Amino acid sequence: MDMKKRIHLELRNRTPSDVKELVLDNCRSYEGKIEGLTDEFEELEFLSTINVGLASVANLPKLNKLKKLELSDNRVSGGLEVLAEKCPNLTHLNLSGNKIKDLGTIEPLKKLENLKSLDLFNCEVTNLNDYRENVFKLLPQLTYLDGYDRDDKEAPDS
Amino acid sequence: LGQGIRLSNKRKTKEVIIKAEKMGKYKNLMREEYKNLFEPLEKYIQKDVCF
Amino acid sequence: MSLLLTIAKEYKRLCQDAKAAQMMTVGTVSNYTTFKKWTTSRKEKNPSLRMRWAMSSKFPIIANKRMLEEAQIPKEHNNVALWEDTEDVSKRDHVLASASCINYWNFCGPCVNNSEVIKEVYKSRFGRLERRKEIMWKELRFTLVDRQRRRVDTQPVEQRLRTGEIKDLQMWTLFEDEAPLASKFILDNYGLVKEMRSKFANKPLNKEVVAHMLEKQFNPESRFLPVFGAIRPERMELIHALGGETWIQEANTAGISNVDQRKNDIRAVCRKVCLAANASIMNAKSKLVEYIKSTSMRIGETERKLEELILETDDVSPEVTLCKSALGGQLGKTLSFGPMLLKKISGSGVKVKDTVYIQGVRAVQFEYWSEQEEFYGEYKSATALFSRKERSLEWITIGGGINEDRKRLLAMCMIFCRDGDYFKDAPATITMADLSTKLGREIPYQYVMMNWIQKSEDNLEALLYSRGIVETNPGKMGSSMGIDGSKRAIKSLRAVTIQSGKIDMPESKEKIHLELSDNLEAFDSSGRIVATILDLPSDKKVTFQDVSFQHPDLAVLRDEKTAITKGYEALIKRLGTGDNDIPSLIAKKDYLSLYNLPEVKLMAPLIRPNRKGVYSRVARKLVSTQVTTGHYSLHELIKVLPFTYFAPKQGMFEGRLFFSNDSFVEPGVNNNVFSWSKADSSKIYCHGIAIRVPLVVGDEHMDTSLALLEGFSVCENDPRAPMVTRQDLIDVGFGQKVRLFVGQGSVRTFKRTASQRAASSDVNKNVKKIKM
C-alpha cells in the first residue's frame, strides 16, 4: 500500500501524541524515504518497519521515549548516527536483512549508552573473522547480540 | 614433425587443417615468428621430417 | 488543491456561456470522443519537404512556457536563440522555440532521480535485444531457397490476450480511480494485474505511452510472408538477417523463448481429456466440458484456466478444434484428415451414398462428394495441390522435398477422395473386426483404410499401384514420380505432376461457428467433417508439470490427500460474506467462534490423535495474536484452524503439525502440502492441486480495492445511502448499502453481499428441463 495510508488507518481517530506502539510492516515508501512521520509522536515507545523497501534514515524525526526499533528486510546502509540525534534513549535494535559491509558503519552506535541488545543476521559483517569479539570490544556497554551474550548465554523470552 | 598447423577465416566460421609436409606450401600465410622458424630448416626437410 | 479550485473556477466560467453549457448538458459523455475530432484537424502532403522548409527557419518548434520558466531555460545563451515570447495560433498556451533548445535541455537541464522504468515500458524490444545477443552466428553460404508464403506470428508474446481483455487491464494498472466494474478476466487474473501495477505505481510517467506499449506487449504481429526453415516467432522477428532468395546466414536459435513447449503441452492435455471423454458412451460432451473447467495449468509465474488459453491460441490441430467447439469458440475454415492438413480453395458438393464388399459379399456404406473441388494439402515437409471429381482424384501437383512424405501425402489424398478400386472392392485382408466398433463406436471405411496403410508399408505400395501406371513420356521426365518417390523414372504414375518449390499457402480471414455430435465429430453447416478422434495418435503416457487436474476421474491421489484437499476447499468456501463466516468474526474479533465451526469438526478425524491437544494450543494462540490486533495473514489461519477443535494440553511442540497420514504443515514456511506466495495471494497449493480463494477481505499484503470486489454486488438504487470513494469502501459493514461512482459518467449502488453461483449451471439445467 503506502506508509501514508497505513498510518492514517492505524490512527483510528487517535491523536499522534498518546500512542505507545506502531507497526508498518509489509508496506512501501517511495524512494526508500520516510513519509508521514513527525515530532507529534511523543509517547511512542516502540516501532516496527519491516519489508518496506527502505534504504536510509534521513526524514526520521526526534523520538526520545522510543526504546526499541525494527528495520529488518530492508536495504539500509550507512546512516546510523541520527539514532544519537533522534533516539538517544534506545535500548533494543535490529538490522538483520540489511546492507552492512564493515564495522566503521557500526561505530556510531557506541554513543547509544542506553543500548542493550542488537540483532545482526544474514549480513556481510557476520562473515568476517572475530566479529562478535571485535564488536564487543567496540561496543562494551552492549550485552546481547542476535540473542546471545558473551559465553553464548541464551537470552530469555522477554 | 607433430600435427600440422590449422587455418581459419576472420570470424573463424571456417577452419582448414593441413599436415606438416605441406607447411612449405603455404609459408606465405603463416605468421612471421612461425615463418622465420621454418625457412632456415626447409633445406633439411625431406617429406614431413627434419634430418 | 489550489489547482482543483482553479479547475472549478474554469468550469464555472465555461458554464456561464450558453453553447458550452448546452453541449455539456445535452447527451451523454461519449460525445466527447466526437468533439475530439472536430478540433485540431490539419494534415500535409509531403511532410519531408515541409520539414526541410521549416527546419530552415529560426523557431520551427513550439513548447510550453511555464515549464521553461520553472526549468530556468534562458534565451540567447551564447548569442544563439532558444525561444522568444509568442503564442501559437492553435494552442494559445505554447511558445515558439528552436531545436537547439532540445540540446540545451539534454545537456544542462533538470535531471530525474531514476529512469530504469523504461526497460519495463518497452520490455518487448529489450527482449528482442537480449535474444539477439544470445545467438551464435555461423558461416555464410550462397544458394537458391524454397521460400513458401504463409501467415505466421513475428512477435514472441506470453499470455496472448484479446482486445476487450486489454482495454480493462490498461485501467486497473494505470488510471484505476476511473475504473469500470470488475470483469471476470480481472477476478481470475489478479496476480497479473498486481504485477503490472507494482512497477507503474507511484512513478512520474506519461500514461498513454505506457498503454500503447502494453498493447504491443500483448499483440502477436501476424503477417503473410515468405518463410524458409523452421517456424518460430524468435526467428521471424529477424528473418531479414537469416536468409533471402539467394543467400543464407546460418545461425542457431533453438534455445530461446521456450514457446512451442507450451503449445505441445496444451495439445497433449487436450488429447488426454478428449480420450477420457471418449471413454464415455452418452455424455462425452458434458464429461469433456467438466474435465475442461475442472483443470488449470501454469504459465511462467501465473496460473491460468485451460478454457481461457484454448480460446486465445491458434493451433489448428484435431484436438484443439474439438475443445474450442465444445466451448462454443469460433475458429477458421481449416480441415484435418489424420496427421495431414487441408484447406479448400474452391468448389462445392454434397454427400452421396455408395457401398463396397469387404470379403466376398458384405455390403458397407461409404459416402463421397458429388462435385468438383480443389484443395491445398500440407504434410511434413511436403505440399500438394489436387482436385477431386466424383469419387476420383482428377489431378495433383507436389512441391515437397522427401520421397516418403511425398508417398504418404499422395496416399492420404487418394483416400480423402475415395479414388481407386479398393473403395469399390476392399481387399481380403480387412475383416469385420478391423472394420469398426472397438466397443460400439462405428468407423467409416476411410479411417479404416487409413490405419490399414499406417500398419504396413506394403498396403501403401498396393494402394499406390491402384493408381494408374504408364511410361514416362519425353520431356515430362522431370515432372514425374515413380513408386519410391523419385523425381524421374522410365515409368511413372498416372495424372501426377512434380516440381521444385513448395506451394504458397492460401489465406482467408474468415471465421465459422461449428458444432459436434455425441461421437466427437464436428460439422460445419454441412455434412463435412473437420475433425474427429480417429485422426490423433492412439495413446501415450506423459507426466505433466505445473498442472491442476482438480477432478475425481482425472486424479491419482488417494482418499487421504483428497480428503485433506476437500476439507481445505470446504473451509475456504466459508470465506464469503454474511455472519457465521470468518470475515465478520474477525471484524468482531470473535476468535472463539472459529473453533466451533463445523468444517474443523469434519477435518478433525484426520488429525494425529496422540498430539491433537498440543497442536490445538499453538493454533489457538496464533489465532488470538493475529485476531486481537488486526495484523493477520489470511493464508495461515486457513491452515491452522483444523487443529483448534480439540482441547489444549501440555507438551513440547517440535515445530510441525502432523495429520494422521504422516503429512504435516508448518506455520510460516511453504511445503508440498500447503504453499503460497505474496506474488499470487489468490491461490492455495495443496498437494500440487490449486485452490482459488475468493476476494472478500484484504490483509496487510493486499493493498487495493481489488481484493474486495468479490464481496460486493449491485442492487436497487437507493438515494438515501451515502456516496463514498473506492478507498473508504473497506470501512463498510457486511450487508450494508452505499452509492458509488463507476468509470465515467455513471453512478450506481452497491451492497457488500456476494452471490455464490455463476450462470453456467442455472441455464443448462433449466434448458434440459425443456426437452422433455
Short mmCIF file of C-alpha atoms in Angstrom, two decimals, chain A residues 16-111:
data_model
loop_
_atom_site.label_atom_id
_atom_site.label_comp_id
_atom_site.label_asym_id
_atom_site.label_seq_id
_atom_site.Cartn_x
_atom_site.Cartn_y
_atom_site.Cartn_z
CA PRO A 16 -0.42 11.14 17.30
CA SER A 17 0.56 12.02 20.87
CA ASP A 18 -0.87 9.24 23.09
CA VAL A 19 0.28 6.05 21.33
CA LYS A 20 2.97 3.72 22.67
CA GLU A 21 3.47 1.40 19.69
CA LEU A 22 3.24 1.37 15.91
CA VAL A 23 3.76 -1.12 13.09
CA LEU A 24 4.24 -0.58 9.35
CA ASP A 25 5.39 -3.98 8.08
CA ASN A 26 4.61 -5.08 4.52
CA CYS A 27 4.25 -1.55 3.16
CA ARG A 28 6.06 0.69 0.66
CA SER A 29 7.83 4.05 0.93
CA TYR A 30 8.75 5.99 -2.20
CA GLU A 31 12.49 6.49 -2.75
CA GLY A 32 13.05 4.49 0.42
CA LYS A 33 12.21 7.67 2.33
CA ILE A 34 10.05 8.04 5.42
CA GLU A 35 6.71 9.69 4.72
CA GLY A 36 4.13 10.73 7.31
CA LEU A 37 6.30 10.84 10.44
CA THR A 38 6.70 13.95 12.59
CA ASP A 39 7.66 15.03 16.09
CA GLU A 40 3.97 14.87 17.06
CA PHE A 41 4.61 11.28 18.18
CA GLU A 42 5.98 11.80 21.69
CA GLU A 43 4.66 8.95 23.84
CA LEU A 44 5.70 6.35 21.25
CA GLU A 45 7.96 3.73 22.81
CA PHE A 46 8.16 1.09 20.06
CA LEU A 47 8.34 0.98 16.27
CA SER A 48 8.36 -1.72 13.60
CA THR A 49 9.16 -1.16 9.91
CA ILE A 50 9.90 -4.38 8.04
CA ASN A 51 9.99 -5.19 4.32
CA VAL A 52 9.14 -1.68 3.16
CA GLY A 53 11.90 -1.18 0.61
CA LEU A 54 13.82 1.12 2.93
CA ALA A 55 17.35 2.26 2.15
CA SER A 56 18.19 5.13 4.54
CA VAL A 57 17.12 7.02 7.65
CA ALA A 58 17.07 10.76 6.95
CA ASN A 59 13.48 12.00 7.42
CA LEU A 60 13.13 10.11 10.74
CA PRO A 61 12.07 12.86 13.33
CA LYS A 62 13.25 13.07 17.07
CA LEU A 63 11.77 10.38 19.34
CA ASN A 64 13.08 10.20 22.92
CA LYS A 65 10.74 7.78 24.71
CA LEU A 66 11.44 5.23 21.96
CA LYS A 67 13.30 2.20 23.30
CA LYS A 68 13.02 -0.43 20.55
CA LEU A 69 13.23 -0.38 16.76
CA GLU A 70 13.00 -2.88 13.89
CA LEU A 71 14.27 -2.27 10.35
CA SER A 72 14.76 -5.83 9.07
CA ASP A 73 14.15 -6.97 5.48
CA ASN A 74 15.20 -3.56 4.09
CA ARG A 75 18.44 -2.40 2.43
CA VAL A 76 19.63 0.37 4.75
CA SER A 77 23.36 1.10 4.71
CA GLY A 78 25.47 3.87 6.20
CA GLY A 79 23.08 6.06 8.16
CA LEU A 80 23.45 5.15 11.83
CA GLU A 81 24.39 8.46 13.50
CA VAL A 82 20.91 10.02 13.51
CA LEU A 83 19.93 7.45 16.12
CA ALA A 84 22.08 9.55 18.50
CA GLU A 85 20.48 12.80 17.12
CA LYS A 86 16.84 11.49 17.23
CA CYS A 87 16.65 8.38 19.60
CA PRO A 88 19.43 8.60 22.29
CA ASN A 89 17.29 6.62 24.81
CA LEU A 90 17.23 3.49 22.62
CA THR A 91 17.90 0.04 24.07
CA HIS A 92 16.91 -2.62 21.52
CA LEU A 93 17.91 -2.56 17.86
CA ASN A 94 17.54 -4.96 14.94
CA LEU A 95 19.01 -4.78 11.44
CA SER A 96 19.06 -8.37 10.15
CA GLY A 97 18.38 -8.34 6.43
CA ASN A 98 20.03 -5.01 5.55
CA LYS A 99 23.13 -3.99 3.61
CA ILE A 100 26.02 -3.81 6.09
CA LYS A 101 29.60 -4.35 4.94
CA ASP A 102 32.16 -3.19 7.52
CA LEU A 103 32.35 -2.15 11.17
CA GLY A 104 33.06 1.53 10.57
CA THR A 105 29.35 1.74 9.79
CA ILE A 106 28.66 0.31 13.26
CA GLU A 107 30.97 2.62 15.24
CA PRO A 108 28.38 5.41 15.79
CA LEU A 109 26.22 3.03 17.81
CA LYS A 110 28.78 3.25 20.62
CA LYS A 111 27.24 6.59 21.59
#
